[PDB]
Every structure is written in structure tokens, then in C-alpha cells.
Design a protein around this nucleic acid. Structure first.
Ligand SMILES: [Mg+2]
Ligand SMILES: [Mg+2]
Ligand SMILES: [Mg+2]
Ligand SMILES: [Mg+2]
Ligand SMILES: [Mg+2]
Ligand SMILES: [Mg+2]
Ligand SMILES: [Mg+2]
Ligand SMILES: [Mg+2]
Ligand SMILES: [Mg+2]
Ligand SMILES: [Mg+2]
Ligand SMILES: [Mg+2]
Ligand SMILES: [Mg+2]
Ligand SMILES: [Mg+2]
Ligand SMILES: [Mg+2]
Ligand SMILES: [Mg+2]
Ligand SMILES: [Mg+2]
Ligand SMILES: [Mg+2]
Ligand SMILES: [Mg+2]
Ligand SMILES: [Mg+2]
Ligand SMILES: [Mg+2]
Ligand SMILES: [Mg+2]
Ligand SMILES: [Mg+2]
Ligand SMILES: [Mg+2]
Lengths: 95, 49, 64, 110, 243, 95
RNA sequence: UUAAUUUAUUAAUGCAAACAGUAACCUGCAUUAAAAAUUUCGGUUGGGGCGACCUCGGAGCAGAACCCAACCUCCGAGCAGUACAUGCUAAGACUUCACCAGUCAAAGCGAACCUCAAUUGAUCCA
RNA sequence: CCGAGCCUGGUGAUAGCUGGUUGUCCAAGAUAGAAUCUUAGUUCAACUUUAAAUUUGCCCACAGAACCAAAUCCCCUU
RNA sequence: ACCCCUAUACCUUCUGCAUAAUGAAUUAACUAGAAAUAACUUUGCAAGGAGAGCCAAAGCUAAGACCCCCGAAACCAGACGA
RNA sequence: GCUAAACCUAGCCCCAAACCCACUCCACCUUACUACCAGCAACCUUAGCCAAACCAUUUACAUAAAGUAUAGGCGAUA
């Protein structure tokens, strides 16, 4: 997403009102894009041991493309939610 | 001004002189819009008070 | 004992009911107090008048 | 507005004094204001013109005017140049003479 | 002359008046609400007051959203809560140069997507922000459920949500025989959400669609008057018998 | 100078005037001199001194200023310790 | 158009963003093009054009308080030198016929024991 | 009636330019200059009008206003 | 009645117009000064005034009293025309 | 004495209140007013005049606070 700051300062309006605008409040100023940014590594739990990237049961931070394109659709990995985490822990304990 | 008020009956010196009393007397008009932060006490009638 | 004002006695258009005004001012008042429930064509006319009136007052004239 | 409390000694500190009883029998009478002051006001018309008004006159304003004139001739070396107005019992007097006028009124006993 | 009710209420009035009155109360409420969406193309002000520079004085600060534009492609498939930004730029970001008009488009992608509730792989026009949102919410299904109708910003998405809700309600054979336990587990995964079936039918509908549905519901061929007459006669006879 | 504004129908104020001048309650407008912070190396001490003084305005000029502002700016102020407070009221005049 | 301001449109590039592996299409930001777009075309002047001039100062016209023109006659300026109390204040005046700008200056406090005819530029912005 | 159609709207476009601007009567009333994309205009000054407050205003006589004609300024009396 | 003597239509625009400068055949009805602050005015009240808020070192509230008409070539938006 | 004059009520303006209309039969999206036969489909910042005495950023579309904070070739103005 493109985040766009507003040049020209909307003049503020009420509690239960909408501020009416002007053809100059349409004049924006680009602040940032969410791409062109340091990418984050998402945390995924693993249902299989794959390559050197991970082991069965271990939660791991991975590149996002890998997570999305390969691991999650094939059923090799699961999202790091508080729901399944407990289950994983239990499994580990059992092991 | 205060002395005058006292003389005239309005603004009673037997009771306290809070701002409210002054307002009632109508020696001091004040307006929060136009940012008046109450009354300042001034010397003008220092002697003969 | 000031239960009512004589400006509540006056019965006329809802916008100028205890309120004098100018021409332009009157128009402005009408546009704000009624505008939303005015007939399109009439609204447009009013707007035009306002545009005109402002120009006449704020620019054209004598004694500026 | 409260009618003021009866003090021990007059005039009161701040120079106020009530109207004496009985009234001073004359051709004219001067009421006081809402606030119990003697109604002798200053007024500037044009940035120039300065005058004073005694405005609560009642009965024979002409007499009052005459009296005023008599009073003020030693202070000027003229007559003061006054305008009475019978309808609204007033007296426009050219030039500031307010405090003095007030004093005079007090002396008279209005 | 003037109108009775202002022009910005006419739509509201319409609802009251006719077939839209006979719509169920739980649907119309949604239409009426109009809550603000989550900020996407603007960084919101955290607090309602701030203290500006220049003068050391606190004053209020309302965060106004950027208008946004959703082309009909967006409606067809999940984008985030985002679309086109029609605006204007000053030439070199200085006001004393030309002002000139600009459309910022978002980066669209095509992706497959599984859903446990529906059991199907959908190919969608998705953007990266959408993906991120999904990740945050964990499941796509979860995201669909969790994400509100005014932040979903897509008709297709709404439809999907509705379908999911219906599935939750009915407890339909989605995975068929051999997977009843599995089905149960899936259902239990989404114990949250799952509205009564008569509400879930109307979720994610437009107004026109809703109206159409209503019409369909209360359609019916007219009852022959003859039958009614016969019934009346019977009643009369019964009465006579009684007396 | 906007004799009737579009939303209210009031006189607006020429804000430049407000920025530049001080309105004393007597009627007099105070201004800072022009070129008082420019090319002081070539200016001689006396000249500099002259430049640094707070000059009063004319009659016509004053009138113009008055016209350009509204009755808010003409009002009586009672600021805590205003350096100019003493100059608002005017004493000892005679035509 | 080789006038100023723009490139929103097309133009390829370049970098991102998406992607894949192994020891291209879209979108965002930059780039120079092509196309265009928004544009304005100062004054004085014995008509206008061309030429000349446009701010400041001294002399004549203007012979004796000020003031006084022309595309009238003649000289010049757009600094330089010396200081580093070329400190700070401040009664009272002059004034380029308005305003703005300019000039002079007693006393005082603080210290010693300016030359020059013009030698210059408002506001806002930096 | 094409150097860029016609129609409606924005548009009572805008015009330092031209034309026009309607009962009676009386009164005071004439053009030093300044800047200015300014010299077909305008703001200030000057003149002018009104209402005020005023105390001097015009006319002026001796004395006086530099060195390299006609007059003027100043100016008590009247 | 005329003959005698006296008498250079009107408006506009001009330094200046009988001008051979503009306009006007004539009648009809229609056809062009509208707004604040600040002043002045006369009322009301008065160290206060105002029927909240505003103003106030005689002020404040009140009314009264000033500020035209017709005209381009234009630019742009959406229709309609081979 | 001809042309002519003259004439009140048609209706209309501004409000107030009150939320309007729309199938006798037949015909009417094809060349509308046409009885009767095998293909598509709506959403996409207004601009400019104008003011700034040019023009290029910019230029308005109950009461009170307040024409205040702000904004602005820090100006027009908002
Ligand atoms: Mg409010
Ligand atoms: Mg008065
Ligand atoms: Mg020329
Ligand atoms: Mg020539
Ligand atoms: Mg001078
Ligand atoms: Mg000294
Ligand atoms: Mg016009
Ligand atoms: Mg001109
Ligand atoms: Mg005369
Ligand atoms: Mg210039
Ligand atoms: Mg001529
Ligand atoms: Mg002649
Ligand atoms: Mg002839
Ligand atoms: Mg002629
Ligand atoms: Mg002519
Ligand atoms: Mg001519
Ligand atoms: Mg003719
Ligand atoms: Mg008329
Ligand atoms: Mg133009
Ligand atoms: Mg053909
Ligand atoms: Mg313009
Ligand atoms: Mg103009
Ligand atoms: Mg031009």
C-alpha cells in the first residue's frame, strides 16, 4: 500500500460531523510505500522435517514467499497461533 | 471601586468577597471567552480605603 | 416576567424569524438553515445569487 | 439594586453622601441614578468638543440653568454657553465642569 | 417552495416506506451503521490532542481518511482494505510548482487460496497487504470471518463470508462420508462466529439483492377466492350446528 | 479586504497588518522601522539607532489600519505584565 | 520556439516489489526522450517602430528664502581610506514637495585627554 | 459569419474602454507634486465640502538671509 | 398672424463643439446607487450599557443617514451535428 | 371623426403547512406508439472564467466562541 500524507491541513469538524473538503485537500504528498521497506520474517510451525530450513515440530522464522508459496498450501507448515501452539507443546511433551 | 461598592450596599464585607459576590454586585464584569482569568487587585484607592 | 421574547411572536420564514440581515447575509442564512430541503433549481439559483452578491459587495462598489 | 445602608458618618469613605431629607424646596429637582450617584456626566462629541450633561432635571429647568450660569461665571470669566432641553430634562454645558458641578449639587442637597 | 424531509434522508425514508420495510430487522441494521474503516493509505493520529510546534499549546486533531477509489475489478476479488488513490501532486513537492493529477494504483497479484470451511481452492486478485492481513489473522477463513464488512471492501469477499457463516450454521456435509470427526474438528476451530441460519442468509448482500430475495420469499400465486368463500361457508355451517 | 465573508457575512481582517503592527487603545498604531535588520555593516550607528526605534503611525495610515482590522483588535486588553500596557491610555491631551 | 513552468500522458531504461532457481506481466520510486499542456510578450517616447534612456549625486536653465520641466546643456557614482567606544542612551529640530526611506543633535551614562558629494535596494523568504 | 463548429451550463464571465445613469430649489466649489508593468488608470499629498474646537490668519517696517535684473523670504504696526 | 429688433437646437465627450464630432423619426409603457467599520443624529439608560456571549479612563444600547445600468472578443464542462 | 384609448380577473410570486405522482381497453427500446421465434450491459478527482489590478502556487460555494486559533506567491484571500 501507498501511504499518502495530506498537504493543506483539513480544518477539523465536530464530534458527530464529517469535515467537508476542497479541491486542495485532494492535493496529497507521498510519505511512504509499504513495499520499499525492510521485509519481515513470519513465524511458522512445521508438520514435517524439510531440508536444513527446519525440523518436525519446531517453530521457525522464514522468508514470506517460502511460507506462502510452498509450505502452507502443501500442508508442510502451520501458522504460529496460540491455538495450535499448545497442541504442539503437548506433542513435544509426549515425545 | 471596592470601597464604593461597600458603601453602596452591594458586595457585603461581613461575608467573604469571592468572585461570585463581586459579579453579583457588578463592580467586576469578566468574560472567559476573551480569555479573562479572573480579577486582579489594584492599588488605585490605596489610602482612603 | 420574561417567559417569552417578542422575537417568538413573529411568524414568517423559518430562517429570518427574529433576525434582520443584509441581502447577501439573508441568502447565506437561507442556504445554511434550509438548503438541504430546497428545490434543486432554486438551490442553484440561490448559490448563483450568493456568488454574485459576494462579488458585488467585496469588490465592486464605491468607498472601498 | 439594593438601597444603600445608613452609615454613621457622612460623607462616606470614597466621597459618597445620600440625598438629604426633606428635599430642598426649589423651582427644580435633580433625581439620582439607579446607583444613587448624582447624574452629572462628561461627553465628547467630535475628538474636539468636550461638554458635560446634568440630565435628571425636573420642574423648572430654566431656573436650574440660570443657577448653573451664576455658579460658573467666576470660573470662566464668561457665561458658560449652555443648552437646556425641556422635553428630556437635561442641560448640555460646554467644556468639562463635572466634579465641581457634582459638588455644587451635593451642597444644594439633591 | 421547500421539501418536508431533506434530500440526504430520502434514501432512509425509502427503506421505511415499501418492500424495504418488510426486510428483516437484523439486515437493515447493518446497512444503517456505517462505521469507519481501518486506516490504510494514511498514518492516523494516535491521540485526539497533541501540542503542535510554533506555539506551545494543545489543540485537537481529527484524522480524516483519504477518499479512495475501488474499481469493479476489486469487487470481483479480494484486495486488502485498499484500492486506487486519485489525488494531485505538486511537481517536485514544493507548492510553488505545478499542481498535477496522480493516480496511485496498488500492486495486484494472482494467488491460489484453500479454505477449510468451504473445501475449495480459489484464485484471487489479492495484494500483498491482503496477504499480510491473512497471515496476521492466520487462516484465510479466519480473516474473512474476523474482518468487518466495511474493511473487507469486496463483494466477493462478503459473499464468501456469508457462505462460511451458512456452513457454520447448517453443519452441512462439507467433507462428506469418511471425515465426520474431521468436519466436527473444523467446526470447533470456528466455534466463535457462527450466527443463527436466518441471519447468515442475508450477510454480505447489496440492497437491491436483498430486495430481490425478499420479493422471492413473499412471491406466491394468489389464493383462489372460491376456496376462501367455501371456508367461510363451512364456518357458518359449523356455527349453525353449534347453535 | 472582504467586507462580507461567504460563511458568516462579517468583515474579515487583513492579517498582514495584525502581524506587523500594534494597536494601542488610544488610537495610535506602533510599527517597527523598515530595514532595521539589513545591511547593518554599511549603516552608521545613529542610523542603526533610528532604525531600531518603535515608530508611531500617521492619521491616514492609522485610519487605513483600523479599516483593515475588526473591532476585536480594537478592544481593551489587560495582559499580566505587558511592556506596552502604560501606552494604551493617553494622558494630558488638549486638541 | 533556442521564452518561463511542468510532465500529468506515451518512451524506453535503472532500482525496488513480485518471482524462480544454483554453487516475463503488473505496481512504487527515479531517468532522459517524444508528445503536449499552462504561458506571457515592461515602460518612456513631439504616432509607433529603430536608436537612446530607466537608480543615485554635483553645475547650468532656476542671477537674491524653498520649489521647478524637456529624448534640454555639462560633469560624475554603484567606492575607497582611516578607525575598532563606527559604545549605549536621549531633550529638540530638518526632510528631496505624500508615505517609505533619509539628515542633524544638546544633556546623560560609559570611554578619550570619522574622512568622503553620489558610493545604494523595501517586504516576504532563505 | 471555422486561426478552430454549434447548443446548454459555469456566466448577471470580465472590461483602468465606450455609451447611458430619471422630481424641484438653494448653497460651498477649479487642475503644486508621488510613486506606480505607470502615464486612457491609481494610492498618497495638494486643492475642494461638511460638522466641530479654536486663536490667531492674511496685509506686513526697521533690522536681517555668500562667497565664488524683476522680485522673494522674514516681518512689528495698521 | 407675418413684416421690425434680439437670439450659433439638446445630450454626450472635450483644453475648446452651432459645429461638417456621438446619439436621437416620433409617441407608449418598460429602462439604471444595493452593502460595514468610523464618524455625525437624536432618543434610552449611565461607571455602566446591552433581553447571556460584547463593549466600557463617558461609556454603551437605538434608530436614521453613503456606495448603478447596458456591452466584447473570451476560457472551460457536458450534450448535438458528416 | 377615424385610428385608437380605457377597463379587472385570468393567473402568478413569496411563504406556511404537509413527504408527492404515476394500468378504461390497445400500442409503445425494430424506423417508439410496430400482435407472433435461439445473445453486449452502470460506477473512474470536475474544469474554467474570475480575484490577485499580468500571471504561473493560490482565489469562499438558530446565536455566540470568531472573523479568534490557524492557513497563505504569509497576499489576494481562505
Ligand atoms: Mg460547535
Ligand atoms: Mg457620547
Ligand atoms: Mg510603448
Ligand atoms: Mg518618434
Ligand atoms: Mg517632507
Ligand atoms: Mg554627549
Ligand atoms: Mg459588466
Ligand atoms: Mg489604463
Ligand atoms: Mg456658488
Ligand atoms: Mg513594478
Ligand atoms: Mg479634441
Ligand atoms: Mg462657440
Ligand atoms: Mg448643418
Ligand atoms: Mg452633430
Ligand atoms: Mg464616443
Ligand atoms: Mg468618437
Ligand atoms: Mg444618425
Ligand atoms: Mg427606477
Ligand atoms: Mg483573461
Ligand atoms: Mg455523406
Ligand atoms: Mg486576474
Ligand atoms: Mg479591475
Ligand atoms: Mg493580457
Amino acid at each position: 500500500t501507498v501511504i499518502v500524507e495530506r498537504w493543506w491541513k483539513v480544518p477539523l469538524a465536530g464530534e458527530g460531523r464529517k469535515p467537508r473538503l476542497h479541491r486542495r485537500h485532494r492535493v496529497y504528498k507521498l510519505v511512504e510505500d509499504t513495499k520499499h521497506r525492510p521485509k519481515e520474517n513470519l513465524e511458522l510451525i512445521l508438520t514435517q522435517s524439510v531440508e536444513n530450513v527446519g525440523v518436525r515440530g519446531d517453530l521457525v522464522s522464514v522468508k514470506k514467499s517460502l511460507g506462502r508459496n510452498r509450505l502452507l498450501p502443501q500442508g508442510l507448515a502451520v501458522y504460529a497461533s496460540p491455538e495450535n501452539k499448545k497442541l504442539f507443546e503437548e506433542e513435544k511433551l509426549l515425545r | 471601586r471596592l470601597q464604593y461598592l461597600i458603601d453602596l450596599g452591594r458586595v457585603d464585607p461581613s461575608q467573604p468577597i469571592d468572585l461570585t459576590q463581586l459579579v453579583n454586585g457588578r463592580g467586576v464584569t469578566i468574560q472567559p471567552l476573551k480569555r479573562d482569568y479572573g480579577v486582579q487587585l489594584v492599588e488605585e484607592g490605596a489610602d482612603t480605603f | 416576567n420574561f417567559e417569552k421574547h417578542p422575537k417568538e411572536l413573529i411568524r414568517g420564514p423559518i430562517w429570518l424569524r427574529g433576525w434582520k440581515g443584509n441581502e447577501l447575509q439573508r441568502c447565506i442564512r437561507k442556504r445554511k438553515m434550509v438548503g438541504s430541503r430546497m428545490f434543486a433549481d432554486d438551490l442553484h439559483n440561490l448559490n448563483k445569487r450568493i456568488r454574485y452578491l459576494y462579488k458585488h459587495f467585496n469588490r465592486h462598489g464605491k468607498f472601498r | 439594586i439594593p438601597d444603600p445602608p445608613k452609615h454613621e458618618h457622612y460623607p462616606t469613605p470614597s466621597g459618597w453622601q445620600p440625598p438629604r431629607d426633606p428635599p430642598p424646596n426649589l423651582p427644580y429637582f435633580v433625581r439620582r441614578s439607579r446607583m444613587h450617584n448624582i447624574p452629572v456626566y462628561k461627553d465628547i462629541t467630535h475628538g474636539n468638543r468636550q461638554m458635560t450633561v446634568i440630565r435628571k432635571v425636573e420642574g423648572d429647568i430654566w431656573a436650574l440653568q440660570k443657577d448653573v450660569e451664576d455658579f460658573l461665571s467666576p470660573l470662566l470669566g464668561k457665561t458658560p454657553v449652555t443648552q437646556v432641553n425641556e422635553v428630556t430634562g437635561t442641560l448640555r454645558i460646554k467644556g468639562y465642569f463635572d466634579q465641581e458641578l457634582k459638588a455644587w449639587l451635593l451642597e444644594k442637597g439633591f | 417552495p421547500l421539501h418536508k424531509y431533506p434530500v440526504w434522508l430520502w434514501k432512509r425514508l425509502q427503506l421505511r416506506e415499501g418492500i424495504c420495510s418488510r426486510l428483516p430487522g437484523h439486515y437493515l441494521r447493518s446497512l444503517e451503521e456505517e462505521r469507519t474503516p481501518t486506516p490504510v493509505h494514511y498514518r492516523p493520529h494516535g491521540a485526539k490532542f497533541k501540542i503542535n510546534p510554533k506555539n506551545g499549546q494543545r489543540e485537537r486533531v481529527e484524522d480524516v481518511p483519504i477518499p479512495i477509489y475501488f474499481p469493479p475489478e476489486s469487487q470481483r476479488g479480494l484486495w486488502g482494505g485498499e484500492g486506487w488513490i486519485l489525488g494531485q501532486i505538486y511537481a517536485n513537492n514544493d507548492k510553488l510548482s505545478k499542481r498535477l493529477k496522480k493516480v496511485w494504483k496498488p500492486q495486484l497479484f494472482e494467488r491460489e487460496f484453500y479454505s477449510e470451511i468451504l473445501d475449495k481452492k480459489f484464485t484471487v486478485t489479492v495484494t500483498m497487504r491482503t496477504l499480510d492481513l491473512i497471515d496476521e489473522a492466520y487462516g484465510l477463513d479466519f480473516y474473512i470471518l474476523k474482518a468487518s464488512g466495511e474493511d473487507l471492501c469486496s463483494k466477493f469477499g462478503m459473499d464468501l463470508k456469508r457462505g462460511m457463516l451458512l456452513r457454520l450454521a447448517r453443519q452441512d456435509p462439507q467433507l462428506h462420508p469418511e471425515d465426520p470427526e474431521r468436519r466436527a474438528a473444523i467446526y470447533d476451530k470456528y466455534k466463535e462466529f457462527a450466527i443463527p441460519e436466518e441471519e447468515a442468509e442475508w450477510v454480505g448482500l447489496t440492497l437491491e439483492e436483498a430486495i430481490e430475495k425478499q420479493r422471492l420469499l413473499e412471491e406466491k400465486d394468489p389464493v383462489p377466492l372460491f376456496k376462501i368463500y367455501v371456508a367461510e361457508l363451512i364456518q357458518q355451517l359449523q356455527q349453525q350446528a353449534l347453535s | 479586504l472582504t467586507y462580507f465573508s461567504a460563511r458568516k457575512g462579517k468583515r474579515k481582517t487583513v492579517k498582514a497588518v495584525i502581524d506587523r503592527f500594534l494597536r494601542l487603545h488610544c488610537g495610535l498604531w506602533v510599527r517597527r522601522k523598515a530595514g532595521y535588520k539589513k545591511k547593518l555593516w554599511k549603516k552608521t550607528p545613529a542610523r542603526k539607532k533610528r532604525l531600531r526605534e518603535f515608530v508611531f503611525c500617521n492619521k491616514t495610515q492609522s485610519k487605513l489600519l483600523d479599516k483593515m482590522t475588526t473591532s476585536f483588535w480594537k478592544r481593551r486588553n489587560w495582559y499580566v505584565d505587558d511592556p506596552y500596557q502604560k501606552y494604551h491610555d493617553r494622558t494630558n491631551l488638549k486638541v
